[PDB]
Amino acid sequence: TIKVGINGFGRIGRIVFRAAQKRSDIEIVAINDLLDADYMAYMLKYDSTHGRFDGTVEVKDGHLIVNGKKIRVTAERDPANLKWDEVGVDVVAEATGLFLTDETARKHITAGAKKVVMTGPSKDNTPMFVKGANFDKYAGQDIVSNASCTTNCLAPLAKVINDNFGIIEGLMTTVHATTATQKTVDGPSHKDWRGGRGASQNIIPSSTGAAKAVGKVLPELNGKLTGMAFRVPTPNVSVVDLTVRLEKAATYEQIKAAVKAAAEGEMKGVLGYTEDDVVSTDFNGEVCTSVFDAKAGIALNDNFVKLVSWYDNETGYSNKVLDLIAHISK
């Protein structure tokens, strides 16, 4: 099995760990963060958004015992001192948000790991991969990125639409759940003044590179999409609102049928499809990274349409982090 070390036990690190427990090809063997093992155990067992851990957690001798398996807990600030080889780690899920370049992330390789997956968009030219878009373009690189949660929602939908009808141009809005970078009441946030405003009180405009980054994993869309975000007072689950102009005339029923076909075919398990009267909490825990909402979208005409797709910005992305780990280990 693929032995994985997690650097950073924030939201993504903890949900990757949970999702990994149901897998048989991967097992987590080590976690690194500035948290005691008993605090680590507490954060794993109790989750406001996703409920109790489905399994056993206990602490003995500074290491976790999760579902009977021993997990090494360290608190190194310098990734180079992590000694991943001592626990036999093949791939590091780099989930701190601080090591998003080749130089910073490589110290995991120096520390004994064989490959690294960043759980966020790279800040340099480290290649980015999105399941359903370009996992098949992986070419043995030892450091990769799984892009962002929003790109994992937008890219599979954009590919289906572009492949079938040709996207001339598109603009995206994501209505996005509150995240850990936000503030409970108005507080300091230099570099992003709006993002410091009280999260529970406000709709907050925010920048996002996700739509531009679709052009990295689908080069045929390179300069054809951009977008923005609004952060809203929900704790999890976000929604993409994609307005596109199409080359080939397509009725809304043709669009729905094309997405449904992909959701049951080449993109099964990545792209979902529903015609039900869903709301955001209906996707809490969703494993698909993009669930097309057929009744919510609307067409002005056969070449100009607004498409709606849901994503659990914690769970879907975390499951595809694990999918990328398994893919680069094949």
Side-chain angles (χ1 to χ4, degrees), residues 1-60 62-330:
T1 58
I2 306 135
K3 319 312 216 223
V4 170
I6 299 176
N7 196 34
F9 213 48
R11 292 305 292 162
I12 293 309
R14 298 208 296 284
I15 300 314
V16 162
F17 185 94
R18 282 203 179 192
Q21 304 300 314
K22 320 104 160 52
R23 294 189 79 104
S24 34
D25 52 16
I26 297 161
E27 85 176 20
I28 310 300
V29 301
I31 305 163
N32 181 74
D33 204 343
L34 306 196
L35 310 159
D36 292 348
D38 59 351
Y39 197 17
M40 279 217 186
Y42 167 77
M43 290 184 183
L44 179 65
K45 168 171 190 181
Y46 298 104
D47 195 280
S48 298
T49 298
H50 299 295
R52 315 277 196 108
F53 179 70
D54 169 31
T56 66
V57 187
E58 100 191 65
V59 175
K60 138 114 228 82
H63 292 341
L64 287 156
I65 282 59
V66 175
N67 286 330
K69 93 184 146 304
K70 267 182 38 34
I71 297 145
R72 186 193 74 171
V73 175
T74 61
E76 318 275 356
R77 296 178 184 270
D78 187 338
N81 292 110
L82 277 167
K83 309 191 199 93
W84 293 115
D85 36 38
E86 253 161 43
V87 284
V89 157
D90 302 313
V91 190
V92 169
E94 158 59 39
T96 68
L98 311 147
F99 311 115
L100 295 179
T101 55
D102 184 272
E103 154 203 281
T104 49
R106 208 160 255 300
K107 333 176 86 180
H108 290 295
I109 310 283
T110 308
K114 295 342 315 183
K115 291 165 170 178
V116 177
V117 175
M118 322 162 162
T119 69
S122 54
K123 279 181 193 294
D124 64 357
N125 66 306
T126 300
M128 265 200 300
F129 296 95
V130 166
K131 199 175 195 285
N134 70 342
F135 267 30
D136 50 27
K137 295 272 189 233
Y138 174 60
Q141 295 87 339
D142 59 0
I143 307 194
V144 293
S145 159
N146 202 45
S148 73
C149 56
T150 300
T151 306
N152 274 262
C153 175
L154 173 59
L157 175 63
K159 175 173 161 53
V160 175
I161 299 306
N162 183 57
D163 282 356
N164 282 280
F165 314 112
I167 295 176
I168 299 173
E169 53 195 358
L171 278 161
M172 155 195 96
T173 293
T174 172
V175 180
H176 196 294
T178 299
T179 66
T181 62
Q182 286 180 253
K183 298 293 188 286
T184 51
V185 300
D186 288 0
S189 177
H190 83 300
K191 320 177 177 177
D192 181 16
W193 286 5
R194 306 194 205 225
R197 306 295 294 285
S200 74
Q201 294 162 282
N202 289 291
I203 298 157
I204 302 177
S206 177
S207 287
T208 177
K212 218 182 163 213
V214 168
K216 290 255 177 37
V217 302
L218 295 171
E220 67 272 23
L221 293 167
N222 189 34
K224 303 197 182 323
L225 305 172
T226 190
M228 67 168 298
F230 296 100
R231 295 292 185 91
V232 297
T234 56
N236 192 41
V237 177
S238 306
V239 61
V240 156
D241 163 8
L242 171 64
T243 304
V244 284
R245 178 152 80 94
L246 312 171
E247 199 194 323
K248 181 206 161 177
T251 66
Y252 200 59
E253 322 179 35
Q254 283 177 290
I255 291 165
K256 283 165 48 178
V259 180
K260 187 179 189 190
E264 316 162 332
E266 143 197 304
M267 270 183 209
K268 183 143 146 213
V270 170
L271 181 69
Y273 176 92
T274 182
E275 292 183 10
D276 284 355
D277 299 283
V278 293
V279 296
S280 59
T281 53
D282 296 327
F283 300 104
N284 192 44
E286 172 67 51
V287 173
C288 288
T289 48
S290 194
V291 183
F292 183 80
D293 186 326
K295 301 214 289 183
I298 193 168
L300 178 70
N301 53 59
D302 296 343
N303 299 84
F304 196 52
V305 70
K306 170 175 305 263
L307 309 173
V308 177
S309 184
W310 297 97
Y311 59 116
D312 179 328
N313 39 284
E314 298 176 345
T315 305
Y317 185 77
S318 292
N319 275 273
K320 269 54 180 172
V321 166
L322 293 166
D323 286 335
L324 185 53
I325 289 178
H327 185 79
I328 71 178
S329 300
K330 99 159 145 163

